[PDB]
Amino acid sequence: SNQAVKQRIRAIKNIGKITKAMKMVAASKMKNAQIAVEQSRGLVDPFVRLFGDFPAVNSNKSVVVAVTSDKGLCGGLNSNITKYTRATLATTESEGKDVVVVSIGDKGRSQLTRIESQRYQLAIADTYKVRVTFGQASLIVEELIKHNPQSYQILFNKFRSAISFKPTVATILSPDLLEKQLEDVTGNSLDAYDIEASHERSDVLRDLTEFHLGVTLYNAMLENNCSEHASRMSAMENSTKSAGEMLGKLTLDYNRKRQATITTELIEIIAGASALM
């Protein structure tokens, strides 16, 4: 029973160096993937200063995406997104609107089914294995365009810094299925612009909203990956703290057992010798 404690110290110390490695790994991945996150942050801005921000609009059909992580030591990031999924998905509910829920990342596949199982249709996963590219987000936008709602919702975590990732819902409306219908006030605000397309405005907005979905989906799953790495860096920071305080308790209790072992073996030896002399 004195060797159960020594091997438990062995287990806690190897766990405490594993988590300290994974903290530095997450910190290394957070800096060389922030060099790709705030590069892609720019292209979201022309579409929001062109189309605006219409989250609570009365869509007939809506596809909501919660883009989450694939690996699992992120520390309550994906669960916070799973709760903001229903927190923003009940604020849409005004007339019995249809909703399709879709998860990007393996840890959203397991977590939305507990709350919304009949409204689940697609799981995109293995997305951060090599990297995130725009052709990939384009294909995910294509399969979100196969069924064609009137609105899109993307739920992710905006990578502010290595401390805060306050989560974000970004909204993308189908071209004149609801978007220009949300633009017409005493005329319209979209009619200021000269459409310089080949075909009509109804097709330049058709192309323009697929490009907006691809840009928003790319930036969402890039910001979510960088916030995942910083959340894992903050999660394995508390794991080495816990595996150090548990190690210190176990080291103190081992010192007690070591002292008691020497005392009890000594008392046995003295009692053996005193029964002869």
Binding site: T19, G72, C74, S239, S242, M246
Partner: protein
Amino acid sequence: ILGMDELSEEDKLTVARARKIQRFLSQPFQVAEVFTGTPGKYVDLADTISGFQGVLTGKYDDLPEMAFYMVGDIKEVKEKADKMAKDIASRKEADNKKVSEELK
């Protein structure tokens, strides 16, 4: 080490239920009320069996953890769970209209 964020949903369910049945095993004693101040409860055996069966099957997952702490039986869990919830609002309006001004 890894927190409750790494657990399964089955594991999160058994951790929540086990915390509730850990708090529910505690009980105020009639001989402890002279130094705890909480009056003690004698819980009958039928009430013990029925209450712990209900917390096992998942009939009382609506209730928080601290509603089970230091109560007699499962009627008092629901009473304390209404009372903790009801208070969550009532924290003020001891501002004026006192019995402790100078000429009361």
